[PDB]
Amino acid sequence: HMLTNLVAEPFAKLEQDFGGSIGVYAMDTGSGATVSYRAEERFPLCSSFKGFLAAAVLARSQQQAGLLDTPIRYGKNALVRWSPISEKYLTTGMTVAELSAAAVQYSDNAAANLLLKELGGPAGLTAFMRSIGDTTFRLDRWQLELNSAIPGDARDTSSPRAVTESLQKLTLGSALAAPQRQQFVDWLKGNTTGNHRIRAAVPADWAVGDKTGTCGGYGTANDYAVVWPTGRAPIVLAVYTRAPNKDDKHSEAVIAAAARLALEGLGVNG
Numbered sequence: 001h002m003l004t005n006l007v008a009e010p011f012a013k014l015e016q017d018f019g020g021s022i023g024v025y026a027m028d029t030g031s032g033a034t035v036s037y038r039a040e041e042r043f044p045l046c047s048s049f050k051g052f053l054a055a056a057v058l059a060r061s062q063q064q065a066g067l068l069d070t071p072i073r074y075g076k077n078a079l080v081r082w083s084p085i086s087e088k089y090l091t092t093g094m095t096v097a098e099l100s101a102a103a104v105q106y107s108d109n110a111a112a113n114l115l116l117k118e119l120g121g122p123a124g125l126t127a128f129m130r131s132i133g134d135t136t137f138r139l140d141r142w143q144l145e146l147n148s149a150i151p152g153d154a155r156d157t158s159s160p161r162a163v164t165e166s167l168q169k170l171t172l173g174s175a176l177a178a179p180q181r182q183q184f185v186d187w188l189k190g191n192t193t194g195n196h197r198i199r200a201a202v203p204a205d206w207a208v209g210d211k212t213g214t215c216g217g218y219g220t221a222n223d224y225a226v227v228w229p230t231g232r233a234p235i236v237l238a239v240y241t242r243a244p245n246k247d248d249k250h251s252e253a254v255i256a257a258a259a260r261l262a263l264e265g266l267g268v269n270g
């Protein structure tokens with residue numbers, strides 16, 4: 001508690017203007033200071049599970065030296081809405097590493113479900129998260145079908161705090177071996193779907209990797225990121241939103257604004 005929320009920030013006004021709930025956890029890995037707002041509430045993961053899926057694949061590759069270069073062939077029935085990379089390789093196959101990069105960097109939906117199969121499904125990914133000490137994360141459903149994200153349903157959710165803690169362990173801590181850690185970081189750094197979220201609060205001359213999520217309905221979208229400000233220790237943060245009513249819109253601008261407040265609360269000049 002000592003170093004949590006040392007400086008107050010107007011998260012409540014931001015979420016009231018948004019018309020929903022915003023969950024934020026941000027960690028200065030140098031000092032241990034944190035910013036925390038609704039940080040232990042559950043929010044839908046949406047596609048943000050895919051970053052952790054790629055990390056689980058990398059963890060497995062530490063024991064399975066051939067995993068990343070394994071070719072995966074798939075049928076047209078594997079292609080679902082928003083599969084921008086895997087649809088181009090339907091007739092050729094893609095490697096596990098390519099599927100991982102597509103899932104992380106284009107939020108390719110078909111690629112994510114193919115990788116989930118390789119890991120033993122939602123319970124297998126959940127097991128990986130338990131293995132790094134995350135007792136909050138839960139993935140419950142396969143990801144071919146357009147799973148609902150309705151309020152109060154704990155399936156396919158985590159908390160901003162657990163997301164941030166797990167992301168820190170995987171990108172900066174010891175949960176992955178060094179080569180795999182850097183590959184996870186590199187995939188996050190190459191993400192193309194987050195330019196209007198946490199990255200919009202981060203100066204262009206700082207390195208940043210992120211993974212986004214967006215669900216249809218209920219104002220539900222999110223982003224998590226590792227940020228390397230120059231000359232100081234990295235920051236790890238997660239911003240999740242939801243809203244009470246089916247037709248409520250999500251907002252990328254609200255995510256960016258919450259990230260700005262988190263950085264300001266940590267005293268990070270940006």
Ligand SMILES: *C(=O)[C@@H](NC(=O)/C(=N\OC(C)(C)C(=O)O)c1csc(N)n1)[C@@H]1N=C(C(=O)O)C(=C)CS1
Pocket residue numbers: 046047048082106107109146147148149193211212213214215216217
């Ligand atoms: C992951 O979040 C993916 N999201 C989706 O497939 C869902 N909806 O997509 C949009 C475009 C928001 C829709 O209106 O259908 C979805 C998943 S579970 C649920 N109830 N809806 C992909 N990832 C991203 C991202 O931000 O990374 C998107 C922008 C949408 S596709």
